[PDB]
């Protein structure tokens, strides 16, 4: 396979701002016929990908002149001179000269806003869940910016990796923030073997982790 | 106007055979230079190309999947077919039908894409969710709902609180079953005094629960 490496994979920008995305291939994407089938697609949520740029530098139909492509061989770039609301989505570069045809991993073009610290909430297992033999502890980490967050589960002080499932929302349409839910699932017997449960998050908004916890004995 | 419509079985069990049909219009696959093929995209993941078939029955396959893949056409009916033998849960994805030509005039590029067809590969049976109310640990308060171990999708989760609430309901994820969570944030004066209910519907299991969050 010809690897298509896009840089970056997440590009926050303000409206009006310039943007650019790099794409480097494992091998030259020059065809035997001398053309370079490098294409760029934009995909919005719910919708299928749309063609933006073909043969390295050519704008497809309906693509505004703020968009441009350049490059040769193994090194390519897409540019947007001024980003507008409609431009936000997932950009993929794509090579169509070699089999198999390969897309890069995708680049999220996202919005910039003022930093926002997460609101963290921890929830002990429900009476309902315990009754049926299970024990989940849930942590909601809500309305933060930027999207980079370090979440850790701690049981009696020490870190816990197994039985954790995470879910993230897309950038919020209203306030441009990000949200996260984390669930730590234990058997009821394991849950009653321990007392102190902690959801801990580090975010660029403070140098000290946000700590939320409860004690099983106090419930 | 060029159209492309994918059709498939929707849900399929591991080890059985996936059969996909693309039905197109506004062009013919008997036009020399013309071709039709397939691309898939797992939910929240990148695009992966599968196979392409030409007017003259030349094809390309993704070599990593070639023992599983068979592409075919019916030019008279405006249809192209893809068969993927012995599928597994990683073959769960949205499957797109795409047109691509090998001449400039006819469009050598992925300009026309169908709306895609979702295929889910799972051994799970129809399972009703376990709905769990998440109460705060002993000026605005956050409540929660955990919807655990259901199949298939979807669940609809709405909140019944009592003037200014912010809801965060998170995309489902697999545990052969799905789990979803949701938070609601209301004012302090709202709770506990007046009731707050997590409402979960899972049509496939005939499930419609109104779960009250009971204070600690």
């Amino acid at each position: 396979d010809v690897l298509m490496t896009q840089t970056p994979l997440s590009l926050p920008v303000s409206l009006g701002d310039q943007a650019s995305i790099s794409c480097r291939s494992s091998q030259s994407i020059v065809h035997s016929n001398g053309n370079t089938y490098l294409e760029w697609y934009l995909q919005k949520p719910g919708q299928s990908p749309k063609l933006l740029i073909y043969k390295v530098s050519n704008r497809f139909s309906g693509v505004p002149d703020r968009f441009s492509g350049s490059g040769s061989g193994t090194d390519f770039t897409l540019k947007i001179s001024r980003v507008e609301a409609e431009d936000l989505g997932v950009y993929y570069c794509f090579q169509g000269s070699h089999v198999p045809l390969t897309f890069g991993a995708g680049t999220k073009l996202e919005l910039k806003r003022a930093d926002a610290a997460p609101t963290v909430s921890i929830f002990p297992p429900s009476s309902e869940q315990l009754t049926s033999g299970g024990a989940s502890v849930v942590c909601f980490l809500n309305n933060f910016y930027p999207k980079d967050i370090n979440v850790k589960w701690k049981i009696d002080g020490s870190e816990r990796q197994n039985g954790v499932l995470n879910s993230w929302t897309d950038q919020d349409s209203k306030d441009s923030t990000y949200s996260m839910s984390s669930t730590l699932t234990l058997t009821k017997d394991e849950y009653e073997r321990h007392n102190s449960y902690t959801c801990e998050a580090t975010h660029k908004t403070s140098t000290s982790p946000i700590v939320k916890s409860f004690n099983r004995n106090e419930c | 106007q060029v159209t492309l419509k994918e059709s498939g079985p929707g849900i399929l069990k591991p080890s059985q055979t996936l059969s996909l049909t693309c039905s197109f219009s506004g062009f013919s696959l008997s036009t020399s230079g013309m071709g039709v093929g397939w691309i898939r995209q797992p939910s929240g993941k990148g695009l992966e190309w599968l196979a392409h078939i030409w007017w003259d029955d030349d094809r390309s396959y993704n070599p990593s999947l070639k023992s599983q893949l068979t592409i075919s056409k019916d030019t008279s009916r405006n249809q192209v077919f893809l068969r993927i033998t012995s599928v597994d849960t990683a073959d769960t994805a949205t499957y797109y039908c795409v047109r691509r030509a090998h001449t400039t005039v006819l469009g050598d590029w992925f300009a026309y894409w169908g709306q895609g067809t979702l295929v889910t590969v799972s051994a799970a049976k129809t399972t009703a969710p376990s709905v769990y109310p998440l109460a705060p640990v002993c000026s605005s308060v956050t409540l929660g709902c955990l919807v655990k171990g259901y199949f298939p999708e979807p669940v609809t989760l709405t909140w019944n609180s009592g003037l200014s609430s912010g809801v965060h309901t998170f995309p489902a994820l697999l545990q052969d079953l799905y789990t979803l969570s949701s938070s609601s944030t209301v004012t302090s004066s709202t709770w506990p005094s007046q009731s707050i209910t997590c409402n979960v519907a899972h049509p496939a299991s005939s499930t419609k629960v109104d779960k009250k969050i009971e204070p600690r």
């Binding site: 016929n33 169509g96 000269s97 070699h98 089999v99 | 390309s60 050598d108």
Partner: peptide, 6 residues
């Protein structure tokens, strides 16, 4: 192999 293009 490479993809078909004229």
């Amino acid at each position: 192999a490479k993809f078909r293009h004229d």
